[PDB]
Every structure is written in C-alpha cells, then in structure tokens.
C-alpha cells in the first residue's frame, strides 16, 4: 500500500492553461473568459483543480 499527500501547485496549472489556448495572453484571462468563474471564485477553484490533475 502506497500513500501520498498532495499540496497545491499553481505553476503546474499555469502552463497547462497556456497550452490549452495558446493564442491568449495571460492565465487569469483564460480562466475567466473561456472557463466560467468570476474573480470571487478563483482561489478555491485553483486549489482543487491542481490536486486533481496532479493525481
């Protein structure tokens, strides 16, 4: 049985968003425009998505 604890990684998600839409400029703009979260719901979203993709 192997166990691992995962923390939050923002640089992990930053590059992935850029590769998803390579013709944009920044990362917050991609997250806000093409995906559907406003500025209030940004920290919490980053938090879970990083860990999910890392697993």
């Amino acid at each position: 049985l192997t166990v691992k604890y995962l923390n939050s990684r923002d640089a992990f998600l930053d590059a992935l968003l850029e590769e998803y839409k390579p013709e944009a400029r920044s990362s917050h703009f991609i997250l806000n425009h093409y995906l559907g979260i406003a500025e209030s719901e940004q920290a919490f979203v980053r938090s879970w998505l990083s860990k999910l993709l890392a697993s």
């Binding site: 990684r9 013709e23 400029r25 703009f29 559907g36």
Partner: protein
C-alpha cells in the same frame, strides 16, 4: 504670454506629459493620402443641420480608414485614405483639396496614426464600410448576464491623446475604463428598440488581439447594464510577484501599447515621456501622524460633549454605539433627550429629502433658535459597516471636525499650527445656494479673513476691496471673478500680489519597464523542480545555519528521488539574515525564486509616496505614507501655483504641513482656506 519652458530632464518622477513626438513625414506622405473638406465661409448661423449632414455624408462613401476634426477656425476636417484612393462626393457645397502629410500639426496626425491603422494591423479592405471610432479598447474582464439572457458584459481600457490647457496646449496621454453591453438587453420583446438604443454606434469583439472594434454587424453597444453607475480597474498590482496579474492593470496595457507601435511602424514613430525635475522630496513616517492625533484629542478632552437623537420612529442603539466609540478614546460624553445650549452637540437625524418642505426640519429648527452653539449631525446608517461591526473611522472624523468648528468659534488657535506669510488677506468667493443661481457671470459674495495680534477677524468683504483685487489680478481675474467654478485667493494689499492654486491634469506614473523585466525573470525561474542533491550539498557545506532544521523537515516528507517543486519552500520567508543566503546560493546555480522589489533604495515606488515640492517652478504633489502596498487604485495629480512675484516667498511652504485635513495623509490645500470655508456655512442661518 508665459510659455511652458520646461527642461530636457535627466532624473525624477515620470509623467504622462509627452515630451516629443517623432514621425517620419516621407514614410507617411508616400504611403497614405490626406484631403480637406472645407465648410468655412458658407454660413456660421446655419451650422447645426449642415454640420450633421456634413459628417454623415462624408462617412457615407469612400474607403476611409479614419478622420479627425480640425480646429474650429482652421482648414476643413482631416481625412485619411490609403494610396490611390478617392474622396468623390457628388455634392459641391464643400470643396476638396488634396494635400501632403507634412502640412498638419503633429498631434492631429499622430492621432490619426493611432486610431485606424493599429486596428487594421492584421486585415484591411475586406468589405465596403470600415471605420474606428476613437482609441484602442483592450480587454481585461467579462461578466455573465442574468439567467434570462445570453452574452457577456465587457470591460475595456481606452488609450488616446488630449491637450492640456494649463501648460500651453501640450499633449497628454489618457487611460479610461469603458463598458460594453449586449444589444438584446435594451430591446423589448415586441421588437421595439428603446429610444436610447435606436440610434447607437455598434461594436464587435475579436478573439485574436482582444480588441473591441467598430462594425455595422455586432451585438454590442457602448452603455452599462442598469443605469448611471461606475466600473474601474486598478492602477498597479504586484500580488505574489506574478507577471499575469501585472498584465491586467492600467500600467500593464500601457506597456503593450508601446509594443504595438513597434510591430506596425518599426522605429518610424516613437513616443517619449517627460520627467519633472526634483530635489526636495519629504517622505512621511507613521509615528509623526500618530503623535499628532494624540495631542489632537487631548485638547478635546477638557470640554463637554452631548449626544441627542431626533428621529421620528426611534430605533437602533445609535447613541449607545457612538458613545462607546467615543469613550474608547478616553473622551467622556453624555446622552440628552433635548440639545443643551452652550455645549458641543452631535445630533442624529434622518434623510433630508424625506421631511416635507414646510415641515420644520429638526436640524434647521434646533439650529436657528440656539445661535451661540456648535453643532454636528449624522445619519444613523453610517455607524455600521457591511458585516455589522461598528465603524471606527467615522467616530474619529466626527471628533476632528468638532474641534475645527470650536477653533473657528473661539477665534484663537488651540493646537500648534505652523506659521505663514504675514500682512496678507484671505478671500473666498461663495456660490449662492438658490436654485435660480445658474447665471454664469452673476456676481457672488466674497468673504474675507485675516489675523491681527493673536485674534482672527472674519468679515464679509466690502465693495471697495473687491474693486481693488480685480485691478491687480490682470489676465488671471477670470479664475476668481468668472465662471461656474471660482477659486479663492490670498492678496497682498501693500504690493498687489496674489496666489492661485490650479489643478492641471497630469497623473504621476511609477517605473513599469524595470519592474516587468524582474517579474519575467521570476516567472522563468519558478518553472523547474530543484534536484535533491543540490539541497543535500547545501546542508553539508553550512552546518551552522539555522535554516537547516526547516529543510530536513521537507525532505523527510518527500520522495527520495523525485525533484522538489517550488511550493514546498513556502514555509521559509525572505526576511532573516540566514534566509537570504540560501536563496542567493540557489540563484548562483540557476534557480532564482525570490527577490526584493519594494525597497526604498530601489526607488521604483516613489511617485506615490511623500510630499514633493519644487520652488522655482512651483510644482507640488502629495501621495500616501509608510511603505508601498501590493494594490494601488489611484494616481496622484499635479498642481501649479500662479503668482506675480519676482521670487515666491519662503513662508508658503509651511501651509501644507497639517495632517488633519486628509485624515492621516498629506494635503494639497492650504489650512487657512479650511476654517474660512466653515464660516460661510454657519452664516446661511443667521438671517
């Protein structure tokens, strides 16, 4: 007349005032076409409809990229068309005259090269009608509409040029927030468009450059959602040292604008900014303000303070809450059911509009009867914040204002103000409060204050004094005795000298190129995962260092082979002595993670702090205190002093050294101009 004879500049704060505009006339004349559509000398009294039709018909036909309007007393309009183009117009009420690209003022032409050729910098001539309204609109934010509609509201930043009347019509940049809304939101379900949106210029979004542009086809008009409201974008943002957040501000778009004039024009056109000279700059700490306010409250301690409530349908413990806030400052007050005569009074009243016209407003009534008493009032809704906790700030403000009126009433200063120029009289114009006072040139009363011995004297200026002032003002009497906005003046009776302080319009800018380079290096550094062997080496080489204890923890919870990411170093800060060496040692090997950007030795964030004064040019500005924050939302302005002096007196500099007019921040207004403005308020109820 006086000309703005500035300096070529070497160092100092950076300004939004353009120093020089360079355009290669040969590259423009040989690549484009300029014409002239003259409507001078036809009829100056039949302008309205003919000018309307002039603009509309000139837009109707011709491959026109853009067109600007010339001076009201100058040649024609100005149009821009590509090479081998035609401005054929059937009507001959106006005459066309082709010209060159070296026969226009520089700013007019540069405006044309800023509008439409940057918007076409990918594709041009695909259809019949094309035009760009004004400026460039980059995109920073989108918001989803309510569930019953579709589309998004868009937020944009606008860049354009404008003149500056105060500095001899020199050119200034601008940056403004504008909002776009979908078309269907203003259209009724029966297909009847509302009156406002029936005739509205339409716009269209883009997916490549993120630029909103003009087009006949498009589902967007320039108007907010609900009604009169405001949307704003922050000035600068360096939160967590990220380069993505620095790209979404009003100084991040400005960096992109200079990178778009290069990739469409090369080096033919460039814009250079001006640095105001400066040698006297006084940073303000936090302890001095604190010690000032302590002595402020001590004087108020030795008096009587009463709180009263005069609401109709009494509710809420506003008196109790306010008294608690006051008593936390060692100032003891009381509660009364009716106001007392001869004591400082803070009254709680209701909304002014609610009470009927002939209803006897509690405030007005209890004022007019008691004519030797200081008064204050507040609404009961302002003592509670958004989350329900009491609001401290309001309490401090009310107490400070009470002291100011007490000082006016007793005619003798209580706290130690500095000294100012002597033998001078203070005059302030006052607008009539009658609703009929929409007359522009109608004479206003002017009130006068002065100091004799140790007592201030307050009186309404007589007619003779008013005749004396206007004679010596000269061309500057328009700012004192004319217009809808009249400014006060200090006058010298013996020599005939005046002082006027004028807001100009420039916003001070901090450094943005030097910050951006550092942020990009940090972003590149924070991408790789640091190998384990390097950390082991560091532990071996420096046994004494205290940081080791932290390191050993992290390595104990991680895989022994997998590299360590940046996020595992969050527990160690860049603050202590042994914590700086570790990060520098990693930097030498190619891992750059943390650095310092807000140090005062660096000097990047100095345009938004302290008090700045230049005596020989008479320029000054004020900003914040302490240390720069991550988020700043306002740009400081620039002011100019107009004088008739051979050399400006050295005593004026002391009138800006008071810390209780802007509530813990430096001010840009002399202190003697505040007391007098509180005497023109308790004189509207005397008779």
């Amino acid at each position: 007349m006086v000309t703005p004879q500035l300096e070529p500049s070497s160092q100092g704060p950076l300004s939004t005032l353009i120093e020089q505009i360079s355009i290669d006339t040969d590259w423009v004349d040989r690549s484009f076409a300029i014409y002239c559509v003259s409507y001078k000398g036809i009829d100056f009294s039949e302008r309205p409809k003919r000018l309307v039709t002039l603009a509309s018909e000139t837009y109707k036909s011709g491959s026109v990229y853009c067109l600007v309007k010339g001076a009201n007393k100058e040649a024609c309009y100005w149009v821009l068309l590509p090479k081998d183009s035609k401005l054929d117009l059937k009507d001959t009420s106006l005459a066309i005259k082709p010209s060159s690209a070296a026969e226009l003022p520089t700013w007019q032409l540069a405006r044309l090269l800023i509008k439409a050729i940057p918007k076409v910098l990918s594709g041009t001539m695909p259809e019949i009608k094309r035009f760009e309204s004004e400026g460039l609109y980059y995109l920073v934010k989108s918001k989803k509409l309510p569930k019953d509609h579709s589309g998004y509201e868009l937020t944009t930043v606008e860049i354009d040029l404008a003149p500056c009347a105060a500095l001899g019509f020199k050119q200034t940049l601008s940056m403004g927030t504008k909002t776009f809304s979908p078309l269907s939101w203003f259209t009724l379900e029966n297909g009847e468009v509302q009156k406002k949106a029936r005739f509205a210029t339409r716009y269209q979004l883009d997916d490549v450059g993120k630029l909103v542009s003009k087009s006949i086809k498009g589902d967007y008009i320039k108007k907010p959602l609900y009604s009169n409201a405001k949307n704003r974008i922050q000035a600068i943002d360096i939160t967590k040292e990220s380069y993505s957040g620095f790209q979404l501000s009003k100084v991040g778009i400005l960096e992109q604008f200079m990178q778009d004039l290069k990739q469409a024009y090369g080096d033919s056109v460039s814009v250079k900014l001006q640095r105001i000279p400066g040698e006297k700059h006084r940073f303000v700490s936090d302890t001095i303000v604190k010690n000032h306010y302590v002595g402020l409250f001590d004087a108020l301690k030795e008096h009587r303070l009463v709180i009263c409530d005069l609401t109709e349908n009494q509710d809420t413990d506003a008196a109790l809450t306010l008294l608690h806030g006051i008593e936390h400052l060692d100032i003891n007050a009381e509660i009364a059911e009716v106001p007392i005569r001869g004591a400082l009074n803070i009254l709680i009243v209701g909304n002014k509009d609610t009470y009927k016209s002939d209803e006897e407003d509690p405030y007005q009534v209890y004022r007019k009867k008691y004519q030797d008493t200081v008064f204050q009032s507040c609404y009961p809704e302002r003592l509670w914040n958004r989350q329900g906790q009491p609001n401290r700030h309001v309490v401090e403000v009310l107490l400070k204002e009470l002291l100011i009126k007490l000082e006016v009433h007793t005619r003798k200063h209580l706290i130690e103000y500095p000294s100012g120029p002597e033998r001078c009289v203070y005059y302030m114009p006052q607008r009539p409060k009658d609703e009929s006072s929409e007359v522009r040139d109608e004479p206003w009363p002017v009130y006068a204050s002065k100091l004799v011995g140790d007592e201030w004297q307050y009186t309404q200026a007589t007619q003779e004094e008013l005749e004396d002032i206007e004679l010596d003002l000269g061309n500057d009497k328009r700012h004192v005795f004319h217009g809808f906005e009249r400014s006060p003046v200090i006058y010298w009776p013996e020599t005939g000298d005046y002082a006027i302080f004028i807001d100009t319009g420039i916003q001070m800018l901090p450094e943005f190129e030097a910050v951006a380079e550092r942020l990009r290096e940090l972003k590149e550094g924070r991408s790789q995962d640091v190998p384990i062997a390097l950390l082991a080496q560091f532990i071996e080489e420096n046994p004494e260092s205290k940081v080791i204890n932290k390191l050993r923890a992290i390595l104990s919870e991680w895989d022994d082979v997998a590299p360590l990411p940046f996020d595992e170093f969050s527990t160690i800060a860049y603050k202590s002595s042994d914590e700086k060496q570790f990060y520098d040692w990693l930097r030498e090997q190619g891992f750059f993670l943390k650095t310092s950007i807000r140090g005062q030795s660096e000097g990047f964030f100095n345009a938004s702090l302290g008090f700045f004064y230049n005596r020989e040019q008479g320029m000054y500005f004020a900003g914040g205190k302490g240390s720069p924050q991550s988020k700043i939302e306002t740009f400081s302005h620039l002011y100019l002093i107009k004088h008739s002096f051979d050399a400006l007196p050295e005593e004026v500099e002391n009138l800006f050294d008071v810390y209780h007019l802007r509530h813990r921040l430096p001010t840009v207004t002399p202190y003697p101009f505040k007391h007098l403005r509180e005497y023109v308020e308790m004189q509207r109820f005397r008779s």
